[PDB]
Design a protein around this ligand. Structure first.
Ligand code: ICS
Ligand code: ICS
Ligand SMILES: [Fe+3]
Ligand SMILES: [Fe+3]
Ligand code: NA
Ligand code: NA
Lengths: 473, 522, 522, 469
């Protein structure tokens, strides 16, 4: 492995036509410090090659805005986008659906051809009013544009100003048309900017909130399976006050209060570094990255976060560490022996391909391949250090590529998404879903690590894997 | 916290005291929550007749739809052809969703590709995407066929699918003889089922329109069977099984049952089974063409009658007892083959099951939704069982269909408290099941939130969901069931009777309260 | 009272206030009922480990058996032969009970007769009943054969069946050529599956013991299949379907699936189908005989080996993956037919299903009961799925059987917490699921009273029942299911996975309480 | 027509041998000196009849809810009868009530050889440690107990005295009698000798002039709760119910009542006659099937009391009138003219005739499994002219009578049900009520009407014939 890896890469690319072989080659690399010298990323997908990527509407509606529980989010366009993305992402929340929370519902303008012809702007204002009579307890409205809204020249920003002023509601236009950008990534930036311009400033004057030196915000935790509740509880046991959760289980008022905090804790850099930079410029609030995947990364991140405060938070940090230490050591003692030595290939989106490596290593596994669907070069710079030498790195991996890499490398476990799952199960290779957590989790924090380890163990050592081959062959 | 000998997932982990208090502090500190008495008040209002009036007055807002966009069906139609790749000209996000939506219903790989149109393609169209698309897909995934549909971006900017494909062949990106049937499938018209019809008619013409001089109706002694958008693998298998039992020669046009059911045996098979391009070229030589779901196969019908010159029979979907009968007798006439002893016995076994279970089925009231052929099948069979289909909602239904269903409803005593809703969604259905409560819903997974809301009002108001339809995401392997034929009827009957008995068991499990009626024999 | 537009049956009629006050008046005035708190105190105590120790010290009293008497299986066996009337020599009450117990499981007619022995036969024997009973049976219902077993009365007084039948032929009540196989089936020995064995050996002996001289093992190029006590129509069919798919000539000796599933077409058919007297007479010329349920076919095995000279292979019941594979590979060696592609694929689909559902099944803990072969087949398959058969109960098991099950359990990580109990009953099982709570029970309809008891202690203590076995009285048409082979394994897996997902849905339906985890997708 | 029916009987009896043909001819008639009844079954002919164990444990003792009833003998008998009969009760099964449990001594060859009496005494003690709140034990003898010479009466006496518990021996062996019938009589005698007298010397029960016992209602479906409600709205006090939802204490208080209301004559007239002899308590038959019979019954019962009860009777009759007339209004049109062939046990083949007629239906053939000629005497008055009467019917006979008469509805037992459904004749279960009910009283008439209608007019019956046949 090293020369066999760079070999493998050239055998696979042999199938493509010339133009795509020369692009795809730049998005596969073997690890050995500045990604701008190893692999290129955040570039359009080669047509017809079965990429895994989604669109900017997924990035804005599905990931950033949809989780915000007390707003109503309108999918503005034909009925497809809102339907495929209804309740497909497990951004969990406490609430009374249909009354004061609305995350798993599908509000939509259901565009017909008449609306393509005359425009959907008069439909939008009529739907804002129906939303108001039927869901009186909503705390604001988002309008997430689908592919056709831009292309036909509608103007949702004017509908928002006018209807927003008329009803004294926040209405946030979001121009997340699916054709914009190359991936979900631009959806993140369009959505962050929409929060900045339409929400985040709403309380710049207000000072009626009582601040403390220990107020923080969790930024980019979308509470998959409760991941962010498993994080908040540690932060508050450490002495801090999480004034806001962006956007897992998040309320619009929690977002309007983030400019009051003293420190912005950023879990998902890729999807939220935009707003965090902005809050540092305008409000003076610093931000740091953290990683609550596994006890080694979680311990290191608590101690780094407590170091920004005084002694008392630092004292409490050690008390949290020691409370949970026997718990994850009982987890390790039980599952590390059943998982040590097993090799993992990852393929996810923008953050987990690097952030979960520490939790596999804490069970004695080895991440021999990883890749991101839509990461940027700063994500790869951070990944180079987490990965070992001569491991395989792949950006916007095609379906053919992933299948062919797996055949040669033969990992013991693959971790990727739904579209990949049943592919490798057929081939005989244990799979765990690393977006939905395979309807399990949380995986964040100490309480999450017990579940991750039990999950990786139940799948990797399950009896079904010994039965793929009929005894008559 | 966690005890390593009993790890808790999110349920019930977050019910531990420390988590419950944190969430209380989060809510009181920073969520500015509406008071709980105001929430209960608004919820009670949403279950009332007054709220239902406002609800049904909606014209611009849709809430919880019961349909998808056309290209989701174009994908499933093309998945039904041998070694063919579904290819969706437009933006790649749509394909990521089509794939996902089907992966979770079938729990199986679903292959589809996109040519990743973006901002720049909006200005000058997607011609270069298509040229490089077809060549890349063809070289990489090695199909015998590539079948082309469109996303809403492609439709709006006005790409010419015919011209771009031809140019891709003139410019030498794909061989000229390589088949690339295509269809326009605009999300802003009709629904996923329409995209099925449009794609089907696309592939029929591709293989047929220019070759008709040679064709002779009936010369191949077979009957064509066009199934439509179909998400139960047993529905393809029952049809094939009954035709073979009568010894009828048949071609099933669009057959995905192999590709949506490959074995787990060490190796990933991208393609499997399916209608050969050749059965498609020779389809005009069949005796006739039967459309199993006529109410979403209008475009296909006009073609098989207009070009193939078949006299397509006026048959309903073969669901339940009468429409299965009529389907077999129509097949018997067309083919010259008698209905065999084995099917006559299976009919009589279905009728026997109906006689054994009628007392638990009688008067049971149902709210139901789905695509139009499947929903009218359910209505028909429910009536045959003595059940009262009270609420019938078809989001993608039309006036002409609604008239047919209302005719069916009037020809039977059990349809008299029934109403058919077209163009209404699951938030309208929510109201109907509060104000005019049925005993069960029959529908797809999205109905679980309607069951949940009704329980919140009270256990006496709860309407339990019976999952039949598409999509089904929260139970495994129901995609393998059957709903057509006498077998499909036997399955639906068993599932309804036992939902009823299970519900009764639960209401009578209370010791010394309601268990006087917890009978061992039901 | 009653409102004519919504009539109430006993449930919920008796929850009306006036009925409620009447029942309270009745209790308080005249029942002399122990007070409610004492009832709670005794109930709590019946859930404790202390109560469980008392319960397992029982040795004279049986409470809630999980077994029936031998003649019930002699009836089911004889029903599997062509135009055969089952005939039970002894008292009529037993036959009334056999018939209704089967009627209620199969929801079909069940033909059996008695010769109505009473007090005066006890003193002088049933010779006259046999002479009149056979002549009346043969003249009235016209069977091609009459198969004779015994009620416990006939056994105790010592009636000789061989003699009484020979006399009946000598004295001209039935022709000498008329077949009247017979078997002693004493109720106070073994159980209902012992009667099946006893009867079967009975019929085999009648048609082959004296006729061996001309018989040659292998000459008819067929395999005999002996199914044993089977109450799933699907299990006959899967066996025949798989042997026909493999091209194997085969003789299913005793086959009731036709008599138990006659169509409802305007006429009653007392007899239908069944193993022909020709098949039984030719059976020794088979290559070999397979016993599908070896653990209650000990007596048959001895005769087939001893007189037929078949080398009966050591096969487990073909349940689950490993044992279905062993069955098919044995069949293939004996017959020289290779296992076809269709079956290799079906196996691969079963593995696929296991791979798609492993996350939800893993570690789930079960209690189960039933007949010995059925129970060890369940145990085997749970172990393959990653489940833990915690409480395994076989009322009619034996020490040898328990030792085979304990070895199976030891061979697997998932057997570590499993215990096997023989000669225990469902009142014993009730303590086990209080003291060492499983997540589910797999059993027959009698487990519904244990589920009821579990819920009374509390909703967090409820063990929900999954109905697999015999009898199933409180759900309709499950007798049509399958449990053998790959098909049967796919059915069981589906039921189990979806019973786990139904339970999780119910625990997470509480609005703003547990519905954070009420996922659309599972 | 009388003679067209008299030739159907002859034609059917042609199949039989001579001995059975001559006996069956006396058990079939077209309507005291008309039919024979309560004789032994002819061997081999597939009767519907059960045994004295079913008639003692399954019908009389089993429902008594606070006692534990032991099936003494091998596992079979108690297992087939577990929960098969719907004798409803209020209770906490397993602690203070026990109706749907199966207690048994599970006889093995050892007990058939050495006897079961040491085993029975050990079982009594085990029942006492595991079920402390039981209020008495009954032991129900299966075929083998009598035949091997056990002495359950001695065990019962000895253990009873030892523990101060009512322990009732019952020799209901299945070979005794010719039917369930003898089991009823044996069971009643067991009640007489071991329970009924327990309170003869006690005088602390506070009587009233309106006290009453319901006798022989087993509370199928709740039938007897829907009868209790009416009796008590009439001003009466139902001190006891026998044996449906019944408690032993209620049994022991029956001799303190002013009147015994016998529903099931066959099964319980024995004990009723005894209570008249010893305690001077009169008895009377009544019939709560349908409104005509329920009204006529209420009025006859009320007439055995004073003007106060007679008033309240008329307030009850007038309260429920609008309800039952609504039932008739809705269902008599849908069921009028339809013919019914009935075959049941000891009572309902005649008692339910009034209810069918209130819905306009005609009962053209009825018969009993185990009735005596006193039951048939009552039946003559209820049945029309030239209708068909059959006693201990055989399967062959009931199938053949049905094919020529072609009734619109048949009501019989589970063993008959699936036979005629196949033939395409609507069938309603008239023992278990097909899991529905209650059918007694006014409340039960609404259910009975709803049930005949749903089956008789069900869409399924129009489909038995394939359109290509
Ligand atoms: S937001 Fe992103 S693809 Fe950072 S769009 Fe995607 S709930 Fe992934 S690796 Mo689905 S950049 Fe979150 C993600 Fe990571 S939806 Fe979830 S799993 S940490
Ligand atoms: S007791 Fe008798 S056979 Fe009178 S043994 Fe039988 S619950 Fe029948 S006609 Mo089942 S004399 Fe009761 C009866 Fe009638 S069990 Fe029920 S229905 S009114
Ligand atoms: Fe799968
Ligand atoms: Fe049946
Ligand atoms: Na899209
Ligand atoms: Na008996």
């Amino acid at each position: 492995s090293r020369e066999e890896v760079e070999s493998l890469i050239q055998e696979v690319l042999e199938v493509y036509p010339e133009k795509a072989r020369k692009d795809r080659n730049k998005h596969l690399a073997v690890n050995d410090t500045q990604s701008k010298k190893c692999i290129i990323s955040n570039k359009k997908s080669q047509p017809g090659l079965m990429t895994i990527r989604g669109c900017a509407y997924a990035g804005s509606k599905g990931v950033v805005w949809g989780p915000i529980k007390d707003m109503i989010h309108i999918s503005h366009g034909p009925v497809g986008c809102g339907q495929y993305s209804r309740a497909g992402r497990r951004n969990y929340y406490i609430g009374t659906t249909g009354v004061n929370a609305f995350v798993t519902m599908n509000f939509t303008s259901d565009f017909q051809e008449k609306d393509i012809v005359f425009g959907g702007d008069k439909k939008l204002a009529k739907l804002i009013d129906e939303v108001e009579t039927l869901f009186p307890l909503n705390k604001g409205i988002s309008v997430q544009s689908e592919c056709p809204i831009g292309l036909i020249g509608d103007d949702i920003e004017s509908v928002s100003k006018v209807k927003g002023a008329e009803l004294s509601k926040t209405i946030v236009p979001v121009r997340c048309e699916g054709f914009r950008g190359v991936s979900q990534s631009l959806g993140h930036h369009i959505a962050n900017d929409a929060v900045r311009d339409w929400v985040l400033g709403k309380r710049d004057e207000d000072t009626t909130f009582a601040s403390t030196p220990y107020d923080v915000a969790i930024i980019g935790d979308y509470n998959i399976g409760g991941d962010a509740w498993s994080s908040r509880i540690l932060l508050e046991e450490m002495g801090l006050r999480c004034v806001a959760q962006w956007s897992g289980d998040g309320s619009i008022s929690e977002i309007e209060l983030t400019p009051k905090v003293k420190l912005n804790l950023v879990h998902c850099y890729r999807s939220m570094n935009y707003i965090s930079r902005h809050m540092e410029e305008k409000y003076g609030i610093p931000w740091m990255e953290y990683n609550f995947f596994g006890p080694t990364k979680t311990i290191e991140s608590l101690r780094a976060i407590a170091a920004k405060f005084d002694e008392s938070i630092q004292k409490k940090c050690e008390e949290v560490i020691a409370k949970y230490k026997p718990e994850w050591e009982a987890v390790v003692a039980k599952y590390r022996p059943r998982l040590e030595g097993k090799r993992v290939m990852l393929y996810i989106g923008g953050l987990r391909p690097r952030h979960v490596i520490g939790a596999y290593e804490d069970l004695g596994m080895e991440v021999v391949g990883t890749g991101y669907e839509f990461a940027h070069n700063d994500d790869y710079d951070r990944t180079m250090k987490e990965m070992g030498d001569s491991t395989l790195l792949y950006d916007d991996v095609t379906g053919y590529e992933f299948e062919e890499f797996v055949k040669r490398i033969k990992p013991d476990l693959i971790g990727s998404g739904i579209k990949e799952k049943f592919i490798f199960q057929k081939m005989g290779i244990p799979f765990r879903e690393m977006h939905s957590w395979d309807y399990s989790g949380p995986y964040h924090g100490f309480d999450g690590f017990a579940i991750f380890a039990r999950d990786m163990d139940m799948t990797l050592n399950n009896p079904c894997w010994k039965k793929l081959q009929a005894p008559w062959e | 916290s966690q005890q390593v000998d009993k790890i808790k997932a999110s349920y019930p982990l977050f019910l531990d005291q420390d988590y419950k208090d944190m969430l209380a502090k989060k809510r009181d500190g920073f969520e500015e929550k509406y008071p709980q008495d105001k929430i209960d008040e608004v919820f009670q209002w949403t279950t009332t007749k007054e709220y239902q009036e406002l609800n049904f007055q909606r014209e611009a807002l849709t809430v919880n739809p019961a349909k998808a966009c056309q290209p989701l069906g174009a994908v499933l139609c093309a998945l039904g052809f041998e070694k063919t790749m579904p290819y969706v000209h437009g933006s790649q996000g749509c394909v990521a969703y089509f794939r996902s939506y089907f992966n979770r219903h079938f729990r199986e790989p679903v292959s589809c590709v996109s040519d990743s149109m973006t901002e720049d393609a909006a200005v000058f169209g997607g011609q270069q995407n298509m040229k490089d698309g077809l060549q890349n897909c063809k070289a990489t995934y090695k199909p015998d066929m590539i079948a082309v549909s469109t996303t809403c971006m492609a439709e709006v900017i006005g790409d010419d699918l015919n011209a771009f494909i031809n140019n891709s062949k003139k410019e030498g990106f794909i061989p000229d003889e390589f088949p690339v049937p295509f269809a326009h499938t605009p999300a802003f018209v009709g629904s996923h089922v329409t995209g099925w019809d449009n794609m089907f008619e696309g592939i029929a013409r591709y293989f047929t329109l220019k070759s008709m001089d040679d064709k002779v109706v009936g010369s191949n002694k077979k009957i064509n069977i066009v199934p439509g958008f179909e998400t139960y693998l047993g529905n393809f298998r029952v049809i094939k099984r009954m035709l073979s039992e009568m010894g009828v020669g048949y071609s099933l046009l669009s057959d995905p049952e192999e590709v949506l059911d490959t074995p787990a045996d060490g190796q990933f098979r991208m393609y499997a089974g399916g209608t050969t391009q050749e059965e498609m070229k020779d389809a005009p030589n069949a005796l006739n063409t039967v459309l199993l779901q006529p109410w979403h196969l209008e475009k296909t019908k006009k073609f098989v009658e207009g070009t193939w010159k078949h006299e397509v029979p006026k048959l309903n979907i073969p669901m339940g007892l009468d429409w299965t009968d009529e389907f077999l007798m129509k097949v018997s006439e067309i083919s010259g083959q008698p209905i065999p002893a084995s099917l006559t016995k299976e009919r009589g076994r279905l009728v026997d099951m109906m006689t054994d279970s009628h007392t638990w089925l009688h008067g049971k009231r149902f709210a139901l939704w789905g695509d139009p052929d499947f929903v009218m099948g359910l209505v028909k069979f429910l009536l045959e069982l003595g059940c009262e289909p009270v609420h019938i909602l078809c989001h993608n239904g039309n006036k002409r269909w609604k008239k047919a269903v209302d005719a069916i409803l009037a020809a039977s005593p059990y349809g008299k408290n029934a109403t058919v809703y077209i163009g209404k969604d699951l938030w309208h259905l929510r109201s109907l099941v509060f104000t005019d409560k049925p005993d069960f819903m029959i529908g797809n997974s999205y109905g679980k939130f309607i069951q949940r809301d009704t329980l919140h009002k009270g256990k006496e108001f709860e309407v339990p969901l019976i999952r039949i339809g598409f999509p089904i995401f929260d139970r495994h392997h129901l995609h393998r069931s059957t709903t057509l034929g006498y077998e499909g009827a036997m399955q639906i009957l068993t599932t309804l009777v036992n939902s009823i008995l299970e519900r009764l068991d639960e209401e009578t499990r209370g010791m010394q309260a309601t268990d006087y009626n917890h009978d061992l024999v039901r």
